[PDB]
Design a protein around this ligand. Structure first.
Ligand SMILES: Cc1cccc(Cl)c1NC(=O)c1cnc(Nc2cccc(C(=O)N[C@H]3CCNC3)c2)s1
Length: 281
């Protein structure tokens, strides 16, 4: 059983400005009538492979199945006319990774942790709806003008970076991915929890690149030898301990998203926890 997605009448949508472009089409900021709200509008290039068309509409189908504060809201689709569009709420501050790198140092630790609680709540909902994201990273999170972070990208065709089965005919990066997903292709909500740990580190570093200039095989060897990302400056000790739990080599030892939300709620309501920093050993 699945939800239909609203079909939006074309006279109801006006594209205003391009905000991005990819191997499929573009994303615009626009306006939608209801009495007139800003939206984001993703088009499919007239000149698409049918594979792209099925992937394009399939992405709208997946998005329409979700209804949660921390998951990008789908307003509807224009599927019967050209150009074909997917229409969502407009997130004023855009992608989280680029946003933090433009806004370095400007937020309180309590604000950063509230951002991470939002993401974790969105991921708990996805996981309990039996949806494995496989591609959780700050680049796939969007931020609105209330600082609310929403999980946003649900594109269908994804391949692991450096997958040996790949040939010359989007890529999921190794250094966001759990070991069991790399070593034997086991993607689950528990490998999403690993990636969430990496997202935690990205947020607490204002968008630093995980493992810096280490190569993919240097990262994998470091991880397998038991090394992990270091504590970001000003990161509360309890937050670093939480990322380290997400990075347990054994799946079973990682927290569930339900545990993460609860832990983050505890700290937010007792916010002097967020000034106790990590010590040495
Ligand atoms: C997430 C999503 C999936 C399918 C279809 C659609 Cl329409 C969407 N929604 C969006 O892409 C967006 C919703 N809100 C957005 N706001 C926004 C505003 C300004 C900048 C950005 C942004 O991240 N831009 C960078 C993307 C890459 N380089 C430019 C995003 S994009």
């Amino acid at each position: 059983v699945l939800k239909f997605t609203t079909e939006i009448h074309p006279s109801c949508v006006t594209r205003q400005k391009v905000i991005g472009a990819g191997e499929f089409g573009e994303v615009y900021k626009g306006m939608l009538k209801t009495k007139e709200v800003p939206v984001a509008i993703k088009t499919l290039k007239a000149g698409y492979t049918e594979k792209q068309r099925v992937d394009f509409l399939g992405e709208a189908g997946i998005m329409g199945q979700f209804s949660h504060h921390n998951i990008i809201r789908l307003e509807g689709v224009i599927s019967k006319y050209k150009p074909m569009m997917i229409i969502t709420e407009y997130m004023e501050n855009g992608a989280l990774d680029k946003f933090l790198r433009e806004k370095d140092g400007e937020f309180s630790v309590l604000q950063l942790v509230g951002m991470l609680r939002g993401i974790a709540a969105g991921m708990k909902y996805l996981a309990n709806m039996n949806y494995v994201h496989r591609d959780l990273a700050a680049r796939n999170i969007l931020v609105n003008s209330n600082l609310v972070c929403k999980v946003s990208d649900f594109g269908l065709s994804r391949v692991l970076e450096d997958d040996p089965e790949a040939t010359y005919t989007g890529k999921i990066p190794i250094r966001w991915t759990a070991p069991e997903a790399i070593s034997y292709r086991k993607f689950t909500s528990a490998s999403d929890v690993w990636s969430f740990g990496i997202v935690m580190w990205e947020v607490m570093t204002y968008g630093e690149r995980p493992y810096w200039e280490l190569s993919n095989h240097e990262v994998m060897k470091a991880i397998n030898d038991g090394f992990r990302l270091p504590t970001p400056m000003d990161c509360p000790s309890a937050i670093y301990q939480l990322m380290m739990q997400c990075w347990q080599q054994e799946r079973a030892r990682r927290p569930k998203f339900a545990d993460i939300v609860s832990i983050l709620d505890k700290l937010i309501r007792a916010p002097d926890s967020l000034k106790t920093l990590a010590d040495f050993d």
